[PDB]
Amino acid sequence: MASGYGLNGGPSRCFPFWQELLACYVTNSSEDNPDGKNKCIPVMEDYYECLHHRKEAARVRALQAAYREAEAKKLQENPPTAGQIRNLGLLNKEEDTKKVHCA
């Protein structure tokens, strides 16, 4: 968020987006030109996007419906079981990994 202090003692995840919006306003808005702050509009939407996630929620909804409807329609040959997925990148399970990656 806007403060700079997050939950682990490290910095807030939306702080870079807040510092850019403040930087943009201070370095574009002035008394001579009231309309420099219109440059700050995209910077302002991004700070809200890092805060609420409505646009990234909207993209994943579209692609997720598109993705499932494609995999559902798509031809199915052999499902890689959870044990096979659990054996990806192991020391002596080369056969399982090859099946998972279809290579």
**Residue of the chain from 41, 63, 66, 88 that contacts other proteins (CB under 8 A):** 41
DSSP letter at 8 equals T
**DSSP H helices in 14-92:** 15-28, 40-52, 54-73, 82-86
Report the length, in residues, of the chain: 103
The residues, any chain, with a CB within 8 Å of residue 11's CB and separated by 6 or more, are 4, 5
Query: Quick check: 59 binds other proteins (CB under 8 A)?
Result: no
Of 18 and 96, nearer to other proteins (C-beta) is 18
Query: Can residue 13 be called a binding residue for other proteins (CB under 8 A)?
Result: yes
Please report, as ranges, the residues that interact with other proteins according to CB under 8 A: 1-3, 5-7, 12-14, 18, 21-22, 25, 29, 31, 37-38, 40-41, 44-45, 47-49, 51-52, 54-55
